[PDB]
Amino acid sequence: HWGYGKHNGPEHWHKDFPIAKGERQSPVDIDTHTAKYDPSLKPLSVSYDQATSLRILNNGHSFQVTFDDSQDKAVLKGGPLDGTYRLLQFHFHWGSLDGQGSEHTVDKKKYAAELHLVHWNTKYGDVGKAVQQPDGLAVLGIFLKVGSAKPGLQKVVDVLDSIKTEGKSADFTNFDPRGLLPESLDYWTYPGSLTTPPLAECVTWIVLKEPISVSSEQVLKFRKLNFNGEGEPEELMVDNWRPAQPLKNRQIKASFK
Ligand SMILES: [N]S(=O)(=O)[C][C][C]C1234B567B89%10B5%11%12B85%13B98%14B%1061B821B326B%1174B%1252C%13%1416[C][C][C]S([N])(=O)=O
Ligand SMILES: [Zn+2]
Prior knowledge:
Number of domains: 1
Bound molecules: Meta-Carborane di-propyl-sulfonamide, zinc ion
GO cellular component, one term: cytosol
Active site: 61 (proton donor/acceptor)
Subcellular location: Cytoplasm; Cell membrane
Number of strands: 15
Distance between the termini: 43 Å
Strand content: 25-35%
Domain Alpha-carbonic anhydrase: 1-256
Radius of gyration: 17 Å
Protein name: Carbonic anhydrase 2
Order of helices and strands: EEEEEEEEEHEHEEEEHE
Structural class: mainly beta
Largest sheet: 13 strands, mixed
Helix content: under 10%
Shape: globular
């Protein structure tokens, strides 16, 4: 099984998923001086007021909070997107120490973590169909730096002890993802891929410029999770990030000057 270790990590993934060496892989380094301001880009529309969270789950690679995506309750629109994208889940990538953890980098700077809110295009009807399409998914990426606590993250942090090991899940209703967003919705965008297997080239990436701050205590709780299942040798769930991949023939566009 793929993972993040020496023998099964990112440098091995191409053997099971040859698209790993494809033309539009993610994440990438965002070179802020080369990204082009595009005045035609619209403001991003984030409509999360009717979001219905369902469960929180340790999937052996991250933890995720899953939403009801059977109706247009929590949707992303505008920005670079055509049409309406339903929120399915959010999850994080993080490091063993604060100087790594993000997938995207900004002028080679790594953040302590990165939040991904994963959305799929309603025109394809279900996420499995959407991953087979070049405009199937839109992932909103938000950097985390360590400093002040993020109050809207605390409800997540506090239940992580109940999903320590792979396969464990818990009820996680009434969680409002608006509490994870920075002030500004200024963003960079580019065409890319899932950053985990199957590495499908189906994502419009929207990466917010403004990080959120989380406390050291909050991120420490992420690092107490385990990659392993209960009863297996304990391996801390840390460094679950894919490094930057070649930009190749792509342009990163900025929504802001
Ligand atoms: N870091 S990331 O790119 O946001 C990966 C998120 C993980 C997934 B996204 B798509 B969305 B779909 B696949 B990918 B994996 B979980 B969430 B949901 C997924 C499982 C199904 C993919 S398949 N195997 O049906 O092609
Ligand atoms: Zn991710």
